[PDB]
């Protein structure tokens, strides 16, 4: 019967990379399965796919909903099972899909019930993956690497450790060369992420940017894809850019960027009291995700914008009005605050104080002067070693 | 735990952390902690002692100090050893002012800069704005290649 | 005159950018060949 | 046809801010228009529409009739298809077929009906002007992407062949089309020139196309070029008082065009109520139009003047400064209206891009603004 | 060249042809109303 394909699975244990093509159908091999179906295995008992038969049993429960004795089973099979894999070198590649389980189910087993059963329990999971992430380090096994690594990471961002996590990368090399691309993409994920956390935005944006690129479409890659791009509008709003509406409607990925829909009709318009009331709106919705405590960073950002718009509309304000736009307490907390966005190159004005107005500087013809000329020579050398670089860059023909 | 984790010297001591943090101008170790401490809190309410840190960053991250420096004022209730990060934090506030106002306009009545530094005193003022290096006039601060060339430049970088 | 100069220097620079997008398509698809 | 009046009415009644006069007479003008075509894929069409009264009996009683003559039709071609010289006449009965569909107003079936009464061998005027009809019901319904894809087909069978006075019908539907989404630019010329020549019997009366291409017009059209092609119009002089719109959307157009500011926004205010809001198809866009409308004005009230002051503003329009401050608050920062504003005086300067001064700053600004995306992307395809 | 990415579920919920700018979407709905009023209003002082 359909075990056939079992055994035609089995026929891709001649050599090397047909493992890769094996796996590839395998993904979807888990299509039908019986208890009746696992005494195949009976009758077919080799190790090398005892390890693999392990995961179709893995498969097989998550896959069936029942998660107890999958742990359980990681436990006291996987490691009488993970010690005669060590010894194999291709092995390691076959149980990457197996460690991408194993945290899994754990991860989701924490969402059943709280024990410190798990923290001691997860501890030593944690511990094992460093310990073989050493020593596949060791092995050269690209793969199997930057799964558990990425697992590892994940583990970081279960728990409220980035800085932990981080030095964890500082003293990491990533297994480049020979990846899959979904991984790559779970890597940059991880990686934007909490080196946006730290505050570091303008490199977060690319490693994110990158988890667009080199993740996948299908149908199914969907979630990371909305996942994602829930982060994505974070940081290009945190870094002060307004993402564009069709960044709002792409899929049915728009249902759930909504209430970043709402942040940005909140942010552009500058408008304090609006922005909060939304977040006390969404909060909720935007703790199930970790982007909330990202979000709450933009008050500074919606009152920047505030003052810019008031001073693209005005010349010159007393500061009573400007207070009263920005529905503030107080003139004294005015000046404080316009007093910052000039020092961050955003309103270029001056203040009169006595009579407390802001006074935004002109342009100051000039033109007849010479200073176009020195103006002019400074963008076109800027032009030139653009230039030049295109052509040494160039060089390769 | 309950047992294990109970003690008052972590209400306390944990505030104190963070506010060590933002001493030293560490944003980063600061908000990763914020994250960090989140989960475990996650019972929190509000932040019972630890606004003090927190609310302490979020106002001056807007940039409106006057409640930040009342928070200055609001340690004392609490108050433990970190007056002397107050020490440290006032005097790394008031540079930002100073950093700001340098920028912000260049022309101040000394009544003034009291009312912004938040001196209680007149002398301390051009104590500060000599160490900041400001003349002062009477109460009254201040704050503050030829084309034949070009041309042969721009040929020599076509030519190259 | 500097403008036009200026503008000039844009026009070069950014057709510039396109000849590497030439080569670094052009090595892409070669090495990428160069596998079999 | 169908008949679209029943359409236009059904609409009015849809709307909550009409006349309530109008939204009567408007609905037994339709229930009316529902008797004499025995008319029911309406009845549950429209009571649903209006629920967004019924009488089942009615409606029984007008599906009968209907598969009465369905039948009668379809019986009629059972006939024909035996009869060899009626090819042309087959398809021609089937006109009358999938028509009678568009008398039953029942989208699907008039589509499958002509779509392959399309096979027999016709005249341009069957295979093109049959499709018009097909998307005709595409209008009447407001699937303005069920439009899309026949214009296409029309587009197609013209582009091979066909009159140019099948062109300038179909240029009529493509343009009313082009107003029925946001894009008026393309009505401008399209519905400017379909005055010209008009053939209503296709969809609307004359003086209603008439009202769109002077509302077009009005809206993307240039001082100059609207008073040549608009202002100037052998045809809508010829109109003028003959509908409710022309009179007030003109009477808005006039005080534009001359410089009546104290009047702008009262006629400005008619319009919106008189000719937009009823328009089936202009109502969904009544908000774009209108904030438009203001920006030209407060721009053609500058363009004079390097300076001037608010009150001045406010006086003439007629509104107090703090709401005309607030009006403009909205444009100026999106770069849409080159004003700026001193509050402290109350005054109003104006930076537009003339004197070769500002055309400097403005051109070092958009230059930097490509140089540092350039060099961004520039870095990328380096290390890449 | 497929995996599952069971960690990332997919969201679970409890449940304009025409290109925009935002300002479409701003769609305040203000003017029209608040004009009549402030009109009316002026010319009634003076």
Not at chain 1, 371 to 391: C, M, S
Not at chain 4, 9 to 31: G, N, P
Not at chain 4, 174 to 180: E, P, S, T, V
Request: charged share 25%; hydrophobic share 40%.
């Amino acid at each position: 019967x359909x075990x056939x394909x079992x055994x035609x699975x089995x026929x891709x244990x001649x050599x090397x990379x047909x493992x890769x093509x094996x796996x590839x159908x395998x993904x979807x091999x888990x299509x039908x399965x019986x208890x009746x179906x696992x005494x195949x295995x009976x009758x077919x008992x080799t190790a090398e796919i005892n390890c693999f038969m392990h995961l179709l049993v893995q498969l097989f429960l998550w896959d069936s909903k029942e998660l107890e004795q999958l742990v359980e089973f990681n436990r006291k099979v996987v490691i009488p099972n993970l010690l005669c894999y060590y010894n194999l070198r291709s092995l390691n590649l076959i149980n990457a899909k197996l460690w991408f389980y194993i945290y899994l189910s754990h991860e989701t087993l924490a969402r059943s019930s709280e024990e410190i059963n798990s923290d001691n329990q997860n501890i030593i999971l944690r511990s094992t993956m460093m310990k073989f992430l050493k020593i596949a380090s060791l092995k050269h096994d690209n793969e199997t690497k930057a799964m558990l690594i990425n697992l590892i990471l994940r583990d970081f961002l279960n728990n409220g450790e980035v800085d932990s996590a981080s030095d964890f990368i500082s003293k990491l090399e990533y297994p480049h060369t020979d990846v899959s691309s979904s991984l790559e993409a779970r890597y940059f994920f991880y990686l934007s992420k909490i080196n946006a956390i730290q505050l570091d935005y303008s490199t977060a944006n690319e490693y994110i940017i990158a988890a667009i690129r080199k993740a996948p479409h299908n149908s199914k890659s969907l979630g990371f894809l909305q996942q994602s791009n829930k982060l994505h509008c974070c940081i290009q709003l945190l870094m002060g850019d307004i993402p564009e509406l069709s960044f709002f409607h792409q899929s049915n990925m728009q249902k759930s960027l909504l209430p970043y829909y709402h942040l940005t009709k909140a942010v552009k318009l500058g408008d304090l009291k609006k922005f909060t009331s939304t977040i006390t709106k969404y909060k909720q919705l935007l703790l199930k995700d970790d982007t909330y405590q990202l979000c709450v960073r933009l008050r500074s950002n919606v009152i920047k914008t505030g003052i810019r718009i008031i001073s693209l509309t005005y010349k010159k304000i007393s500061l009573r009005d400007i207070c009263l736009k920005l529905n503030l307490d107080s003139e004294q907390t005015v000046e404080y605050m316009v007093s910052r966005a000039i020092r961050d190159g955003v309103i270029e004005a001056k203040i009169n104080h006595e009579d407390g107005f802001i006074e935004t500087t002109e342009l100051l013809n000039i033109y007849d002067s010479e200073d176009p000329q020195q103006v002019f020579d400074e963008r076109i050398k800027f032009a030139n070693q653009l230039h030049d670089e295109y052509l040494v860059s160039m060089r390769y023909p | 735990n309950h047992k294990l984790s109970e003690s008052d010297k972590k209400s306390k001591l944990i505030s104190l952390y963070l506010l060590n943090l933002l001493s030293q101008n560490n944003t980063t170790k600061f908000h990763s902690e914020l994250q960090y401490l989140d989960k475990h809190i996650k019972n929190l309410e509000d932040d019972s002692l630890l606004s003090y840190p927190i609310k302490l960053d979020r106002w001056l991250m807007e940039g409106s100090y006057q409640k930040a420096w009342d928070l200055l004022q609001s340690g004392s209730q609490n108050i433990s050893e970190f007056d002397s990060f107050t020490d440290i934090l006032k005097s790394a506030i008031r540079d930002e002012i100073a950093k700001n106002t340098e920028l912000s306009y260049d022309f101040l009545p000394l009544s003034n800069i009291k009312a912004l530094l938040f001196f209680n005193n007149e002398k301390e003022t051009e104590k500060f704005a000599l160490e900041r290096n400001w003349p002062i006039v009477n109460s009254k601060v201040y704050f503050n290649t030829n084309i034949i060339e070009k041309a042969m430049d721009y040929a020599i970088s076509i030519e190259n | 005159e500097l403008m036009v100069i200026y503008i000039s220097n844009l026009v070069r620079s950014i057709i510039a950018f396109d000849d590497l997008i030439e080569n670094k398509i052009q090595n892409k698809k070669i090495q990428e060949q160069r596998v079999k | 046809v169908p008949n679209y009046e029943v359409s236009e009415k059904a609409f009015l009644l849809t709307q909550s801010k009409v006349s309530i006069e109008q939204r009567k007479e408007a609905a037994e003008f339709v229930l009316a228009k529902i008797k004499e075509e025995e008319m029911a894929p309406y009845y549950k069409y429209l009571c649903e529409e209006y629920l967004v009264k019924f009488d089942q009996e009615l409606y029984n009683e007008l599906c009968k009739k209907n598969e009465s003559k369905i039948k009668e039709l379809n019986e009629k071609i059972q006939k024909l298809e035996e009869d060899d010289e009626g090819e042309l006449e087959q398809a021609q009965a089937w006109i009358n077929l999938g028509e009678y569909y568009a008398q039953i107003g029942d989208k699907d079936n008039a589509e499958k009906t002509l779509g392959k009464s399309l096979s027999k061998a016709i005249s341009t005027g069957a295979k093109i002007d049959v499709m018009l009809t097909i998307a005709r019901l595409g209008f009447f319904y407001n699937d303005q992407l069920y439009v899309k894809e026949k214009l296409e087909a029309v587009n197609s069978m013209i582009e091979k062949g066909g009159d140019w006075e099948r062109r300038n019908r179909y240029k009529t539907y493509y343009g009313i089309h082009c107003l029925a989404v946001r894009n008026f630019k393309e009505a401008a010329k399209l519905l400017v020139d379909s005055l010209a020549t008009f053939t209503s019997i296709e969809l609307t009366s004359y003086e209603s196309i008439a009202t769109y291409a002077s509302v077009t017009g009005l809206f993307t059209l240039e001082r100059t070029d609207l008073k040549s092609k608009v202002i100037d119009s052998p045809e809508l002089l010829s109109l003028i008082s003959t509908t409710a719109a022309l009179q007030s959307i003109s009477s808005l157009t006039i005080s534009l065009y001359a410089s009546d500011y104290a009047s702008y926004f009262p006629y400005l205010l008619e319009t919106y109520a008189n000719v937009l809001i009823p328009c089936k198809y202009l109502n969904r866009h009544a908000d774009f139009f209108v904030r438009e409308m203001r920006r030209k004005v407060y721009a053609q009230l500058l363009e004079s003047y390097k300076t001037l002051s608010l009150k001045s503003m406010a006086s003439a329009f007629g509104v107090s400064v703090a709401f005309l401050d607030n009006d403009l608050g909205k444009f100026i920062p999106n770069k849409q209206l080159n004003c700026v504003i001193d509050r402290v005086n109350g005054i109003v300067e104006t930076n537009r891009p003339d004197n070769k001064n500002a055309q400097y700053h403005l051109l070092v600004k958009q230059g930097d603004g490509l140089l540092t995306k350039l060099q961004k992307y520039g870095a990328a395809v380096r290390l890449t | 060249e497929d995996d599952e990415f069971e960690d990332f579920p997919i969201d679970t919920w409890a449940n304009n042809i025409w290109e925009e700018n935002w300002d479409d979407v701003e769609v305040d709905d203000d003017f029209t109303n608040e004009l009549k009023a402030e009109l009316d209003r002026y010319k009634r002082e003076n």
